Design a protein around this ligand. Structure first.
Ligand SMILES: Cc1nccc(N2CCCc3nc(C4(NC(=O)c5ccc(F)cc5)CC4)ccc32)n1
Length: 374
């Protein structure tokens, strides 16, 4: 894969070895983000954010510092807007935080809101550099509240992203085998993708240990919520000293992951085509990815179809290898519906996520119908 797309070998779509600390100029931002559970509970976060001076973004030179500054400012924006998470909400984001955040967001080509690329892909570190990428050795940089299971929720999402990296690196081999006209290399490449997607499902199983249902629904789901089609923030969030009118932006979700879309585009599973609701959302969430990663997904569509290549040739081995990738995806989609039933629906039923289930049923229905043999 080309280096311009920003896909690491082992790490994949995730940012390899992100920065923990910023430079000395951004200590006032870094204090509020590090102690975000403490300042919300005491009722002094909105006091601390309003006290800030408008720090310029010129000292953030390299890419990893800018991604850290997006994560720091993004988490502060969710904490300032939502607050304790008991109805009391802020429509106005102050100039001291909003001006540098929108300027930094415009520079990186992202919306000024916490996305999957901030809170999963950039929000991690390695405890021991010698020891490998696993949950015991890994830890998140920032959290919202105490007992929110943000460590469990974001790292298990990241580990599935890291598991998918082994499938991603062999994508060049698939398109090279089609143009060069090599059946056995194409069959070998597809079985390797199917194997890696099967292993990614076993990594997905770790979410039950590290996250609980009551913690995600009541606490962590509130902070990940955006301001697009929300009864609380109807018109949107006004960013002070940057835009005049309030601009709407959707919150964090699985659809913002490039892993969520790339294998559908590779295998010709028509998610984005056929202008339904689930199609439009997945297309909209490409702008919530980083610019290099949306270009990667878009460049997969430019290459010729793997489905039509496998369909045109009357080859049972290629069809079985193609179906192994699709069946591996259906298993991941099926398992994601079991998580949304456990972590959103059952917590919601015990109080005085229908649209999220209806989305993931439609995404799975598209994946299952794309099978050649049942
Ligand atoms: C191909 C495929 N199939 C099924 C699922 C799938 N992904 C993308 C790779 C990891 C992944 N993680 C989550 C989980 N996390 C989130 O949905 C999530 C939500 C909000 C947020 F701000 C950040 C992450 C763990 C619940 C769901 C789907 C998938 N990818």
């Amino acid at each position: 894969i080309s280096k311009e797309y920003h896909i690491d070998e082992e790490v994949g779509f995730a940012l390899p070895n992100p920065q923990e600390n910023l430079p000395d100029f951004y200590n006032d931002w870094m204090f509020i983000a590090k102690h975000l559970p403490d300042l919300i509970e005491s009722g002094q976060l909105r006091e601390r954010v309003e006290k800030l001076n408008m720090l310029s973004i010129d000292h953030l030179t390299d890419h990893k510092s800018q991604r850290l500054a997006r994560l720091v400012l993004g988490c502060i924006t969710m904490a300032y807007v939502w607050g304790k998470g008991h109805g009391d909400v802020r429509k106005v984001l102050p100039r001291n935080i909003a001006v540098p955040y929108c300027q930094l967001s415009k520079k990186l080509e992202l919306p000024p809101i916490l996305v999957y690329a901030d809170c999963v892909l950039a929000n991690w570190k390695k405890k021991d550099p010698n020891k490998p990428l696993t949950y015991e050795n890994m830890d998140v940089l920032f959290s919202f509240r105490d007992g929110d299971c943000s460590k469990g929720f974001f790292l298990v999402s990241l580990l599935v992203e890291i598991a998918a990296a082994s499938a991603i690196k062999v994508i060049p081999t698939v398109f090279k085998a089609m143009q060069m006209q090599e059946r056995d290399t194409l069959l070998k490449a597809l079985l390797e993708i199917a194997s890696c997607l099967e292993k990614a499902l076993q990594v997905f199983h770790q979410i039950h240990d590290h996250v609980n249902p009551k913690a995600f629904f009541s606490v962590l789901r509130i902070y990940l919520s955006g301001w697009k089609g929300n009864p609380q923030l109807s018109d949107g969030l006004v960013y002070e000293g940057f835009w005049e009118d309030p601009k709407e932006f959707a919150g964090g979700s699985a659809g913002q992951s490039s892993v969520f879309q790339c294998f559908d585009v590779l295998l010709g599973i028509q998610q984005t085509a056929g202008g339904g609701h689930a199609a439009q959302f997945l297309q909209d969430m490409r702008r919530y990815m980083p610019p290099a990663h949306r270009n990667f997904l878009c460049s997969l569509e430019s290459n010729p179809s793997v489905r039509e290549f496998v369909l045109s040739k009357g080859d049972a081995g290629l069809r079985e290898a193609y179906d192994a990738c699709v069946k591996a995806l259906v298993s991941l989609r099926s398992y994601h519906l079991q998580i949304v039933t456990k972590y959103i629906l059952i917590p919601a039923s015990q109080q005085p996520g229908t649209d999220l289930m209806n989305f993931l049923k439609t995404v799975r229905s598209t994946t299952e119908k794309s099978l050649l043999k049942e």
